[PDB]
């Protein structure tokens, strides 16, 4: 195979890297030829920091108001360290 390559490249970042091996019908496939039990955590085995609509026992997938450890701000040390206390 020669000429310009639209073949997926790891170094190139973007759409190409996505879903490797989960895709059939790829140009590659032809060339190849030649989890939790319950969505909601156990009620007894968890206690939620904020009850009510702040509950995080159920796993909502998608774009959902939860925040990774990567993301900083709003809570944690940004609410906890502002005022001195003994």
């Amino acid at each position: 195979i020669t000429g310009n390559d639209i073949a997926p490249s790891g170094r190139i970042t973007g759409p190409g890297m996505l879903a490797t091996g989960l895709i059939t019908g790829t140009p590659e496939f032809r060339h190849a030829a030649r989890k939790p039990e319950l969505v909601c955590a156990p009620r007894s085995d968890q206690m939620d920091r904020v009850s009510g609509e702040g509950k995080e026992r159920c796993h909502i997938t998608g774009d959902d108001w939860s925040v990774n450890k990567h993301i900083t701000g709003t809570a944690g040390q940004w609410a906890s360290g502002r005022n001195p206390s003994m």
């Binding site: 997938t61 998608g62 774009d63 959902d64």
Partner: protein, 92 residues
């Protein structure tokens, strides 16, 4: 509101519970109930991103113990205009 919140349940009784729990927990609209087949029923709600987060969490908790249960609870905070075709506008 343009955020979507979809709960999937095994059976209709858990789905009606979810619809009720979601609609009473937040200012969301029940937009549809779909019989997917294989006894999967999806309830879809639409409201602002905070209302949809609250509603889905409420629905999930409520339906987790009604019938066969919860298969999914999902939020799409912005939905592409293409997907608005496969989404039900009004419950019927």
């Amino acid at each position: 509101g343009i955020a979507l919140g979809m709960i999937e349940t095994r059976g209709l009784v858990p789905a009606i519970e979810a619809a009720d729990a979601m609609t009473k927990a937040a200012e969301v609209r029940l937009v549809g109930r779909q019989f997917v087949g294989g006894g999967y029923v999806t309830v879809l709600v639409r409201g602002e991103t905070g209302a949809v987060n609250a509603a889905v969490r409420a629905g999930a908790d409520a339906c987790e113990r009604v019938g066969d249960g919860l298969v999914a609870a999902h939020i799409i905070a912005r939905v592409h205009s293409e997907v608005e075709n496969i989404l039900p506008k009004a419950p019927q």
